[PDB]
Amino acid sequence: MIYPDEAMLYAPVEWHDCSEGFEDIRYEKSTDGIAKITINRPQVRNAFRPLTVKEMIQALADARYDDNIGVIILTGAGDKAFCSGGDQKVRGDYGGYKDDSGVHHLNVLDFQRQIRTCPKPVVAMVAGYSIGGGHVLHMMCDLTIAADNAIFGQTGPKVGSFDGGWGASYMARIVGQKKAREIWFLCRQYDAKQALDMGLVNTVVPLADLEKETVRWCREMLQNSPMALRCLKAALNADCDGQAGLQELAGNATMLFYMTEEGQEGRNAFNQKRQPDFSKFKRNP
Amino acid sequence: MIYPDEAMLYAPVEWHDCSEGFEDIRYEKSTDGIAKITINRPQVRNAFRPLTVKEMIQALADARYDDNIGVIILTGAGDKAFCSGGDQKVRGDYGGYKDDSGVHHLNVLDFQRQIRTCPKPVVAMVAGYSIGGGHVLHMMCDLTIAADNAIFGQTGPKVGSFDGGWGASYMARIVGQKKAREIWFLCRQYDAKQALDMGLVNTVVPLADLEKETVRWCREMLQNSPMALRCLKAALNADCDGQAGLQELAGNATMLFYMTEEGQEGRNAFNQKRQPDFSKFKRNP
Amino acid sequence: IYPDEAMLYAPVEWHDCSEGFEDIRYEKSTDGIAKITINRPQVRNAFRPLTVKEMIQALADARYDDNIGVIILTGAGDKAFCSGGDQKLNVLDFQRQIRTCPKPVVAMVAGYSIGGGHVLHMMCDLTIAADNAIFGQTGPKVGSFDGGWGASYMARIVGQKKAREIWFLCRQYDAKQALDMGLVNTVVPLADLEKETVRWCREMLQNSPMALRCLKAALNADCDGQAGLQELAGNATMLFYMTEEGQEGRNAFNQKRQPDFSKFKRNP
Amino acid sequence: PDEAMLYAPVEWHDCSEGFEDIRYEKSTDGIAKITINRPQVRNAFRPLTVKEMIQALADARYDDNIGVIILTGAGDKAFCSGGDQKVRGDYGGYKDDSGVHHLNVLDFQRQIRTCPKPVVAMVAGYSIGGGHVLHMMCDLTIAADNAIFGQTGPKVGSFDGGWGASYMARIVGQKKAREIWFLCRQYDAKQALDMGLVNTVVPLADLEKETVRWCREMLQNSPMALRCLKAALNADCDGQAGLQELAGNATMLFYMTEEGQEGRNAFNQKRQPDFSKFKRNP
Amino acid sequence: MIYPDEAMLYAPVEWHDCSEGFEDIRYEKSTDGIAKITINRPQVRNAFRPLTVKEMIQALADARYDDNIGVIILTGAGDKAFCSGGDQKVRGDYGGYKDDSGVHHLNVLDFQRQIRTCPKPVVAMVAGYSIGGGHVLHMMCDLTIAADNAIFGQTGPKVGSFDGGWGASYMARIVGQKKAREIWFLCRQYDAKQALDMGLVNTVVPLADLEKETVRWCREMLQNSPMALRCLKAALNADCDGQAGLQELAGNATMLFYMTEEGQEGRNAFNQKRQPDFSKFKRNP
Amino acid sequence: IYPDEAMLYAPVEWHDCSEGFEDIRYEKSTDGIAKITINRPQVRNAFRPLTVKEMIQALADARYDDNIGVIILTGAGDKAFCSGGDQKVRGDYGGYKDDSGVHHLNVLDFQRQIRTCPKPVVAMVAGYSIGGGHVLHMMCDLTIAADNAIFGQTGPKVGSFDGGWGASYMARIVGQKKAREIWFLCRQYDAKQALDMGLVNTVVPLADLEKETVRWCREMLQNSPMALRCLKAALNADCDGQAGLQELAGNATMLFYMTEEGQEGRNAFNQKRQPDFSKFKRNP
Ligand SMILES: CC(C)(COP(=O)(O)OP(=O)(O)OC[C@H]1O[C@@H](n2cnc3c(N)ncnc32)[C@H](O)[C@@H]1OP(=O)(O)O)[C@@H](O)C(=O)NCCC(=O)NCCSC(=O)c1ccc2ccccc2c1O
Ligand SMILES: CC(C)(COP(=O)(O)OP(=O)(O)OC[C@H]1O[C@@H](n2cnc3c(N)ncnc32)[C@H](O)[C@@H]1OP(=O)(O)O)[C@@H](O)C(=O)NCCC(=O)NCCSC(=O)c1ccc2ccccc2c1O
Ligand SMILES: CC(C)(COP(=O)(O)OP(=O)(O)OC[C@H]1O[C@@H](n2cnc3c(N)ncnc32)[C@H](O)[C@@H]1OP(=O)(O)O)[C@@H](O)C(=O)NCCC(=O)NCCSC(=O)c1ccc2ccccc2c1O
Ligand SMILES: CC(C)(COP(=O)(O)OP(=O)(O)OC[C@H]1O[C@@H](n2cnc3c(N)ncnc32)[C@H](O)[C@@H]1OP(=O)(O)O)[C@@H](O)C(=O)NCCC(=O)NCCSC(=O)c1ccc2ccccc2c1O
Ligand SMILES: CC(C)(COP(=O)(O)OP(=O)(O)OC[C@H]1O[C@@H](n2cnc3c(N)ncnc32)[C@H](O)[C@@H]1OP(=O)(O)O)[C@@H](O)C(=O)NCCC(=O)NCCSC(=O)c1ccc2ccccc2c1O
Ligand SMILES: [Cl-]
Ligand SMILES: [Cl-]
Ligand SMILES: [Cl-]
Ligand SMILES: [Cl-]
Ligand SMILES: [Cl-]
Ligand SMILES: [Cl-]
Ligand SMILES: [Cl-]
Ligand SMILES: [Cl-]
């Protein structure tokens, strides 16, 4: 197989700001098809409050619908933290995190599903702490590129929380059941080499090379078939998500079927008020 | 167990219009907590175009976030059709249904997921045809109340489409594998009695009684525990949706854990920069 | 719009393709139906290893004949569809072959469908039963069991209470009982059995063969884990190959150049 | 099975010594019967009741003369009304005499599930709430014409989102399961039969007579085949826990073969095993 | 996150004997909440006979119901073996291991289920051989701490047995399918480093420090929320055990619901013979 | 307790069974190993529909030969194991074209055949295992890799994908993070990289590839064939839902037939009596 030149992979990146209207995040797009979502609350180690999550959902929705975007990067502002999870300062007694109107949210669950069902690869670019809900977020991303200063772990049993959804089951599909139980039960911190050794991240690079390397990985994907990528992502989800995974995988099959003459004949016949004739389309074995 | 007040179930219903801004649907709310989404394209048997689906998504999102709403009804305008599925007149060659900007969508998949993950019961109120994607929509709703004039079925293999996601697997969890294969492979139409006999709808009533009966069922649910309902809906999805189902079910467990003193101690300790003391909370077996 | 009943109930012209077979008949109609008939009425159409080998061969032929769109499985005579394994484990291979067949398979049942013969009708996508049809398992009565698709898939048809009843007691069930529990798709008078079955086949023969195979795979996928994903994804690959985007990948490789996927717009 | 055998008289030997909340009885032809005996509270279970039911079911499992177990309630008015609400504490469960909070019916559910002998629910009158989940968990349900079924969770501030939800759906389908749980209606015996929730409905006066007939039909059959099929049917629901049961039965069968035994013998005789004598099947 | 002091983690441990009545095992409890079950048949490399398993089941049940116990350690007596599986000297022809009365048991399957469903973490403390059924036992434990002399492997295909239950499927969820097939098909032995590298154990420590390090890990968990731990254990089981896993996870959710005012209102209304009133409890989104 | 190394590393005697095959070689050892070798080195051992048909035929023979206990799959030469579907014959109409113009995806049949084979199948990989050829080594129960082996997928680059066992089952081997990397980027991985991620069972010098593979086969050949087939089914059952249950339960039925209780139906028939199951003591 022929491969892309490293010179192109390491070409300069031109980012354009698309952050207007956002208070808690930055949102940027490169000319060559990368969207970057940056949590921008470094004073609280990039913890998310409900507003933060709402903005991330809005940005990811925009990235999904922009046909010039092929890959999304999720990251945190600064070098100290990717994300430290839900903002404990606004965590209420009544079953969620409080917004300024007093409504209690667990809206990161919506963002998790949105990352999961996104037909474009999402890459976590991790510098410093990826902890708690912030650790589940990196796990949800298809790939994780980690700096050598990255630190990983959960804190639920120490802070009176837990993610028993994708935070548990999907973690096990990454690091295996023994390591998943250790990570959750003891709530230790793991350095970048430890994370790499257990298969929790895809690669570790020096912090100075983090963005350069991440952009390289994104560009490798951008050279590939977007249709193939979305089908494979759905197929990999389908090993985990039961009928919800089937919904994604089968939905892509329908999309492909619509592009065939056989599928189109069914539509055409209905619009033309006649019976379809599928006899011209030979049956494969 | 004491029973609901029968006279109360049949009290008059006061609807308020919330349709401002919508072109393809109506959206209404009752004073006692029912939201009603009505597809309003009877000239095409209430077939949905991408705009229709976008509007339904917006209304369901509003219903989810309105804490005064406890149950949602999905229905079609007029008595002739609930929904005839995707609008074939705008179905493009390029893998989806075309909006006025020429973008190709399969956004009913998003709407399916939104119904699935909605923590409030969604009730399909079916008069006349529920066909194709419109049949999958009634199936996705938690309950279906059918008029005696209701007609059910798929048309995919006749019209050059298929829903191999929840439209297939989840149908089988309702009517069984033999009936599911019949429904999909032959694309016949089934009357209301046939649908009831196979467990495809919850009840059949005369058309004249359809809204009255639907409102009664909604009111029975509205007097019950909203927390129990959302946990049970998640638990029933979890028999189908693998890790995506675990995400919903465990997420509700987290919400409940946040309401306990043990959970709150973890938050409090973190905010107060001290170690938590969980020893006061006795271990159940 | 639906096909005319005059067409659905038109006469059927069968051609024999049974050369070489000792235990079965194999026939094909002009309009795309293949029919496999277990032909051992003297033993209530029980299968022996040769029978199973022949059925596999016939079904393999039907799969590869692009003129065939639907397969009927049935027994010779009016007394039995199949009474299972011969009294005096390759049927598992035959079960798998029915499951993975990209064409609909219809069980046409007159009289007894019992034991391994009962699991066979269940494996078929649809079952059309005559009013004299009788259904049930016998394993626990004779010291056997089918704990594979014979158990789990049975439960996906009739539900868990009835599956346990059917297996634990080994009663016989008449056609009405089977219909009521969702075990068969329809019941018709014995004299009309083939006539109605052919109608059902012809209704499917009017529909998209690609859609049918995708849906069959999708329904299998609710049951068969990664093996089901293999079928469903495999059809997706087949479709992808028919697209310009897929073909560009092939063309680029053969032309020893990098592919350019940029003309193929990203759908949301 | 002819009628003389299926409808032979029904006689019981009492084995209830030591129990406060249940009766436990055995027949000569291989049936054990566990009867919840708290009719004054519609046969609601308190933690002691569940502990006793577990003890009785364990006894039935280990008694090689027993092939089938019947679960039922005393009197004609109730099978079981679920957890005893009078002793339900604030701290996450039902309180015993020590003040410990239990949800021990979950242990009893798992024990019915993994029991290698068929368990049959014999239902007269109310099977409601946790009592309804109990009939669903039994392999078969025989209902009297006076039987009434339903859940009450969303009305009583509880839910069974385990086998009470998912397994119900495998019986009545997802539409009916959501109706049963969300509305908390009661369903009569005819309604239950029509939706497939029970296996048969019989006149109340004939309830035990018919239940015992069903038991006797199973008792004529292979106990090993039954336990393998029960495991196989659980395996369609219970993932690896189901695989544990099904494969466990395969191990038991393998131990009974000469091939399996050669391995043991070789180890005990401190030599290499020789499996060459045993032909490889396709 | 603040972590416990190492001085506390490595403080001496004081054990109290609770072995009265046991013939094949020891059972001990520490003042700070650890229960330890020790197989005591070193003359047969700590192989279990049916009595051994019955005793282990009794001890584990005691640990589950003792509200002062938060973590359980499973181990073997001496330094040479953790457990060598079923006692082949008492394995009968008739489908199981014989007790002194001649009844044939496979009761370790009950013990596997009991470890699985135990709401407290169970830790395998492994010195020397963990082989056959004894290897499955370490795998079933939530975590495994191994001494540098530990040896791991299966022997089924060599001794005429197999564990195709959790011994196969769950092994694959720990070490992956390639290694699971290697381990089972060839029946080799693996040293502690090999086991660590494939993710089969959580850590490897010097033999002299085995209990010291194990007690440290236990104490780290004892500082954490017992409710969070049991929910996460159930959640991780749920990725494997289908509806049986849902029973555990949902059961914990019910327990939490019982602790809420909303749940309690339902109980109260029933006990007071009145309609429940759930209107005071706001619906979260 | 364990076998002798002298026996494990003894010479191997192969006899040819390739008569009739155009695209593969097929050989059997005296001690119970069958070896299927793809023989199209000029296309890096890429398979066309005929190649797959022949491999299916050979594997069926090995399955049915009771003298065979283990099967090796490998490629001819040292440069390639298999490079996947032959792109030179890949048609527009949904598959790879044979000489008659029929479009096939018959490697899917071969995948299922390897999966359901009751004997262990071992991938012996020298050089490239790429694309459909990479899925094939993954499907094999074990993979022994030479130090020159190269692994990877190319789907998104060549306009294809295997979203069946090629995706889900890969994830059960290397985990979800690495599976997504392997598929999304289509890089190549060397033998060390593959070993480190758990994609292969061992890496050995190329000169020793067959010697070590035969040793692994011989270690399995000394073990119980029944236990091995039950375990293979049990391990498939963690992945394949009801299809996996079919295999596992089918083995249970076979075992049951070997017991007196299982035989009671046959015996009753021959003795002209009704079966009596009351006589068999119930285990708990
Ligand atoms: C390991 C650190 C990330 C960094 O340590 P470091 O020593 O560098 O800094 P530190 O001094 O702790 O923190 C700096 C400042 O940031 C703040 N901060 C850090 N993390 C958070 C945070 N998560 N929330 C609020 N404030 C935070 C600190 O309070 C402090 O600010 P200050 O009070 O001085 O003004 C540490 O800050 C830490 O342990 N943070 C807490 C992590 C944590 O427990 N997160 C919540 C876990 S649970 C969760 O995320 C979550 C969310 C949504 C869920 C939805 C459904 C189901 C489950 C969910 C869930 O589990
Ligand atoms: C429909 C009945 C069964 C019968 O109606 P009926 O009108 O004939 O009789 P009733 O007058 O209500 O009852 C007669 C007496 O029995 C008592 N009783 C009936 N059921 C219960 C009961 N369940 N608990 C305590 N007392 C009960 C009544 O209080 C009353 O006693 P009294 O005041 O005269 O002294 C009715 O009594 C009734 O609705 N009972 C309550 C049903 C109920 O809500 N059960 C609890 C559901 S939740 C549950 O069971 C459960 C248990 C364990 C779980 C574990 C893990 C996860 C979930 C769990 C779970 O959801
Ligand atoms: C059985 C009816 C519902 C009613 O018959 P009736 O005789 O009463 O009325 P009819 O005369 O046919 O229709 C009245 C008018 O409505 C129009 N109409 C009805 N349904 C549709 C429709 N679905 N699309 C466009 N026009 C429709 C007719 O064209 C006609 O309008 P006109 O031509 O006079 O201007 C019939 O109209 C009918 O078969 N309609 C087509 C149903 C159909 O095939 N729908 C699409 C199935 S597939 C689909 O929905 C779908 C959508 C999204 C998906 C996303 C992911 C994966 C799969 C998806 C999917 O499969
Ligand atoms: C590698 C060793 C663990 C240690 O080697 P070492 O060289 O240090 O010691 P060794 O000389 O072999 O043994 C010392 C003494 O202990 C005895 N011993 C060791 N293991 C066992 C043992 N498992 N049973 C009985 N005796 C044993 C030896 O016989 C010997 O006793 P002695 O002759 O002096 O009186 C070796 O002893 C050994 O391979 N033992 C056998 C391991 C084995 O095959 N276990 C059974 C596997 S299958 C299993 O466990 C099992 C159980 C329940 C199941 C239930 C359901 C489904 C499956 C199940 C299952 O697969
Ligand atoms: C990395 C190599 C294996 C070796 O590189 P190398 O540099 O050593 O050699 P190269 O010069 O590229 O190749 C040598 C010769 O072999 C040929 N060749 C190698 N592989 C293939 C090949 N796969 N098809 C056709 N020709 C091939 C080359 O064209 C060339 O021949 P020539 O033109 O000079 O006559 C490279 O040749 C390569 O990338 N080959 C293509 C691999 C490839 O994309 N395979 C198809 C992936 S998709 C697939 O396998 C597949 C199959 C069935 C499926 C069924 C259901 C669902 C999915 C399926 C599926 O995805
Ligand atoms: Cl920055
Ligand atoms: Cl956390
Ligand atoms: Cl009109
Ligand atoms: Cl449709
Ligand atoms: Cl069903
Ligand atoms: Cl309830
Ligand atoms: Cl073993
Ligand atoms: Cl590929």
What are the distances in angstroms from CA D224 to CA D253, E94, E161, F217, F275? 9, 12, 19, 35, 14
Q: Which residue has the tokens 């339902």?
A: E266
In a domain, C116, yes or no: yes
Beta bridge partners of A131: A153
Give dist(CA C60, CA C57) in Å, integer. Answer: 5
Task: Answer for the pair D149, D98: CB distance below 8 angstroms, yes or no.
Answer: no
Closest partner residue to A226 (CB to CB) among C66, C253, C266 is C266
Give dist(CA D262, CA F224) in Å, integer. Answer: 9
Tokens of C251: 């063309």
Q: What are phi and psi of C185, to 5 degrees?
A: -85, -35
Find the angle CA(C109)-CA(C112)-CA(C116) to the nearest 5 degrees: 95
Q: Which residue intervals of D195-275 are DSSP H helices?
A: 207-219, 223-235, 239-255, 258-268
| Residue E259: how many other CB atoms lie within 10 Å | 23
Q: Per-residue DSSP letters for A86-107?
A: B-GGGB-SSSSEE-TT--EE-T
Residue count of chain F, please give it: 284
Question: Is the distance from the beta carbon of residue B251 to the nearest atom of ligand 1 less than 6 Å?
Answer: yes
| E34/E160 same-domain check | yes
Give dist(CA B245, CA A92) in Å, integer. Answer: 25
Report resolution (Å) to 1 decimal.
1.8
Give dist(CA A229, CA A235) in Å, integer. Answer: 10
Give dist(CA C211, CA C219) in Å, integer. Answer: 12
Residue count of chain E, please give it: 285
What are the distances in angstroms from CA C7 to CA C2, C198, C209? 11, 11, 19
Cβ contact, residue pair B228, D159, below 8 Å: yes
Task: Answer for the pair D35, D23: CB distance below 8 angstroms, yes or no.
Answer: yes
What are the distances in angstroms from CA D21 to CA D93, D115, D120? 19, 22, 20
Q: Which residue has the tokens 């469908």?
A: C113
| Residue F279: how many other CB atoms lie within 10 Å | 9
Residue count of chain D, please give it: 282
In a domain, B283, yes or no: no
Q: Whose CA is closest to C41, among C87, C77, C84? A: C77
Task: Answer for the pair E280, B226: CB distance below 8 angstroms, yes or no.
Answer: no
What are the distances in angstroms from CA F189 to CA A257, D195, F149, F182? 34, 56, 8, 9
Distance from CA of D258 to the nearest CA of E (A): 9
Distance from CA of E93 to the nearest CA of A (A): 35
Give dist(CA F238, CA F173) in Å, integer. Answer: 13
Helix or strand holding residue A47 (H, E): none
* A134 CA to centre of ligand 1 in angstroms: 9
Give dist(CA C239, CA C210) in Å, integer. Answer: 9
Question: Is the distance from the beta carbon of residue D106 to the nearest atom of ligand 2 less than 6 Å?
Answer: yes
Q: Whose CA is closest to B131, among B84, B163, B174, B87? A: B84
What are the distances in angstroms from CA C256 to CA A3, C139, F87? 11, 60, 12
| Residue E215: how many other CB atoms lie within 10 Å | 25
What are the distances in angstroms from CA C20 to CA C16, C23, C98, E121, F102? 11, 10, 22, 64, 25
Instruction: Among A181, A198, A222, give the residue marking a domain's end.
Output: A222
Its sign, for the CA torsion B189, B191, B196, B197, is negative
| C45/C73 same-domain check | yes
Calculate Rg over the CA atoms of chain B.
21
Tokens of D163: 């086998």
In a domain, F283, yes or no: no
Strands E151-153 and E129-131: parallel
Q: What residues contact E118, with CB distance under 8 A and at least 6 apart?
A: E60, E63, E64, E72, E233
Q: What are phi and psi of C82, to 5 degrees?
A: -170, 135
Find the angle CA(D144)-CA(D145)-CA(D147) to the nearest 5 degrees: 65
Checking phi first, is residue B37 left (phi over 0); if not, alpha (psi -120 to 50) or beta?
beta
Beta bridge partners of D25: D14, D33
Task: Answer for the pair D49, D24: CB distance below 8 angstroms, yes or no.
Answer: no
* A161 CA to centre of ligand 7 in angstroms: 6
Q: How is residue B49 annotated by DSSP? A: P
| Residue F147: how many other CB atoms lie within 10 Å | 16
Helix or strand holding residue B36 (H, E): strand B34-39
Total H helices, total E strands in chain C: 12, 11
| Residue F271: how many other CB atoms lie within 10 Å | 9
| E173/E228 same-domain check | no
Q: Whose CA is closest to C204, among C81, C85, C102, C78? A: C102
Q: List the domain range (segments joined by +) for residue F246.
A: 222-270
Task: Answer for the pair F179, A203: CB distance below 8 angstroms, yes or no.
Answer: no
Tokens of B112: 């399916």
Cβ contact, residue pair A256, C265, below 8 Å: no
Beta bridge partners of B152: B130, B190
Give dist(CA F210, CA C187) in Å, integer. Answer: 61
| Amino acid type, D124 | A
Half-sphere exposure of F177 (CA within 13 A, CB side): 27
Treating both helix axes as pointing N-terminal to C-terminal, what angle do B177-186 and C193-205 enclose, rounded to 10 degrees? 60
Cβ contact, residue pair B202, D179, below 8 Å: yes
Task: Answer for the pair A258, C42: CB distance below 8 angstroms, yes or no.
Answer: no
| A143/A174 same-domain check | yes
Q: How is residue C120 annotated by DSSP? A: H
User: Does chain D touch chain C (at least 3 C-beta pairs within 8 Å)?
Assistant: yes
- Pick out the residues of the known binding site of F for substrate: 44, 83-88, 96, 128-132, 154, 160, 257, 272
Q: What residues contact A148, with CB distance under 8 A and at least 6 apart?
A: A192, A204, A205, A206, A207
Tokens of E218: 């236990």
Total H helices, total E strands in chain B: 12, 13
Distance from CA of E210 to the nearest CA of D (A): 31
Give dist(CA B67, CA F224) in Å, integer. Answer: 64
Question: Which residues of chain F are at the D interface, by a Cβ-Cβ cutoff of 8 Å?
Answer: 3, 63-64, 66, 68-69, 118-119, 222-227, 230, 234, 237-238, 242, 245, 248-249, 251-252, 254-256, 258-259, 261-262, 264, 275, 277, 280-284
| A245/A187 same-domain check | no
Q: How is residue C47 annotated by DSSP? A: B
In a domain, D10, yes or no: yes
Give dist(CA F263, CA F271) in Å, integer. Answer: 12
| C136/C214 same-domain check | no
Task: Answer for the pair F258, D257: CB distance below 8 angstroms, yes or no.
Answer: yes
Q: Whose CA is closest to E1, among A3, B276, C248, F202? A: B276
Tokens of E184: 């089972």
- Pick out the residues of the known binding site of E for hydrogencarbonate: 154-156
Give dist(CA B138, CA B74) in Å, integer. Answer: 8
In a domain, B235, yes or no: yes
Give dist(CA E279, CA F16) in Å, integer. Answer: 81
CATH of the domain at C126: 3.90.226.10
Checking phi first, is residue D42 left (phi over 0); if not, alpha (psi -120 to 50) or beta?
left
In a domain, C113, yes or no: yes
From the CA of D196, the nearest ligand is 10
| Nearest residue by C-alpha to atom 40 in ligand 4 | E84
Give dist(CA F265, CA F272) in Å, integer. Answer: 10
* E164 CA to centre of ligand 12 in angstroms: 10
Strands B151-153 and B190-191: antiparallel
Instruction: Among B203, B222, B241, give the residue marking a domain's end.
Output: B222
Can you state the percent helix, strand and coil of chain D, rounding each to 5?
A: 45, 20, 35
| C200/C238 same-domain check | no
Give dist(CA E188, CA E249) in Å, integer. Answer: 36
Cβ contact, residue pair E157, F234, below 8 Å: no
| Residue F236: how many other CB atoms lie within 10 Å | 26
Tokens of F54: 């022949």
Q: What residues contact D2, with CB distance under 8 A and at least 6 apart?
A: none
Q: Is residue F114 helix, strand or coil?
A: helix
Give dist(CA F224, CA F26) in Å, integer. Answer: 25
Task: Answer for the pair C210, A260: CB distance below 8 angstroms, yes or no.
Answer: yes
Task: Answer for the pair C61, C95: CB distance below 8 angstroms, yes or no.
Answer: no
Strand ordering across the sheet containing C80-82: C80-82, C112-114, C134-136, C173-174
Distance from CA of F20 to the nearest CA of C (A): 21
* B58 CA to centre of ligand 9 in angstroms: 24
Q: How is residue C147 annotated by DSSP? A: -
Instruction: Among C167, C182, C205, give the residue marking a domain's end.
Output: C205
Q: Which residue has the tokens 């409102």?
A: B215
Give dist(CA E2, CA B160) in Å, integer. Answer: 60
What are the distances in angstroms from CA D239 to CA D43, D231, E56, E116, E243? 33, 11, 25, 13, 7
Q: How far out from the chain centre does Cα E217 lie?
A: 14
In a domain, E285, yes or no: no
Domain count for chain B? 2
Ligand 1 atom closest to residue A163's alpha carbon, by position in its atom list: 58
Closest partner residue to C242 (CB to CB) among F92, F111, F262 is F92
Q: What burial letters (b/e) apply to B158-182, b meaning 16+ CB within 10 Å?
A: bbbbbbbbbbbbbbbbbbbbbbbbb
Helix or strand holding residue C43 (H, E): none
CATH of the domain at C217: 1.10.12.10
| Residue A76: how many other CB atoms lie within 10 Å | 29
Strands B34-39 and B25-30: antiparallel
Q: Which residue is closest to D218 within chain C, CA to CA?
A: C169
From the CA of A248, the nearest ligand is 3
Find the angle CA(D137)-CA(D141)-CA(D144) to the nearest 5 degrees: 140
Distance from CA of A114 to the nearest CA of C (A): 13
> Would you call A58 exposed, middle or buried from its count of C-beta atoms within 10 A (0-12, 13-18, 19+)?
middle
Cα dihedral B269, B272, B274, B276, rounded to 10, equals -10
Most ligand 3 atoms within 8 A of CB, residue of B44, B152, B187 to mutate: B44
Give dist(CA D9, CA D32) in Å, integer. Answer: 15
| C193/C89 same-domain check | yes
| B218/B236 same-domain check | no
From the CA of B107, the nearest ligand is 3
Q: How is residue F222 annotated by DSSP? A: T
| E202/E141 same-domain check | yes
| Residue A119: how many other CB atoms lie within 10 Å | 19
Question: Is the distance from the beta carbon of residue D47 to the nearest atom of ligand 2 less than 6 Å?
Answer: no
Tokens of E12: 């001496």
| F180/F73 same-domain check | yes
Give dist(CA B139, CA F178) in Å, integer. Answer: 37
Half-sphere exposure of E137 (CA within 13 A, CB side): 32
Find the angle CA(E28)-CA(E29)-CA(E35) to the nearest 5 degrees: 90
Q: Per-residue DSSP letters for chain E?
A: -----HHHHTS---EEE--TT-SSEEEEEETTSEEEEEE--GGGTT-B-HHHHHHHHHHHHHHHH-TT--EEEEEESSSSEEE--B-GGGB-SSSSEE-TT--EE-THHHHHHHHHH-SS-EEEEE-SEEETHHHHHHHHSSEEEEETT-EEE--HHHHT----STTTHHHHHHH-HHHHHHHHHH---EEHHHHHHTTSSSEEE-GGGHHHHHHHHHHHHHTS-HHHHHHHHHHHHHTTSHHHHHHHHHHHHHHHHHTSHHHHHHHHHHHTTS----TTSPPP-
Q: Which residue has the tokens 């039994």?
A: D138
Residue count of chain B, please give it: 285
Q: Is residue B140 helix, strand or coil?
A: helix
Q: Is residue F38 helix, strand or coil?
A: strand
Q: Is residue D186 helix, strand or coil?
A: coil
Cβ contact, residue pair D165, B202, below 8 Å: no
Half-sphere exposure of A43 (CA within 13 A, CB side): 3
Total H helices, total E strands in chain D: 12, 13
Task: Answer for the pair B150, B128: CB distance below 8 angstroms, yes or no.
Answer: yes
In a domain, B12, yes or no: yes
Give dist(CA B175, CA B190) in Å, integer. Answer: 13
From the CA of A76, the nearest ligand is 6
Q: Whose CA is closest to A139, among A97, A173, A189, A108? A: A173
What are the distances in angstroms from CA C32 to CA A265, A279, C63, D180, E266? 20, 11, 12, 45, 62
Total H helices, total E strands in chain F: 12, 13
What are the distances in angstroms from CA A231 to CA A184, B94, E210, E268, F198? 31, 16, 48, 52, 25
Residue count of chain A, please give it: 285
| D46/D181 same-domain check | yes
Beta bridge partners of B190: B152
Contacts of B200 in chain D (CB under 8 A): 175
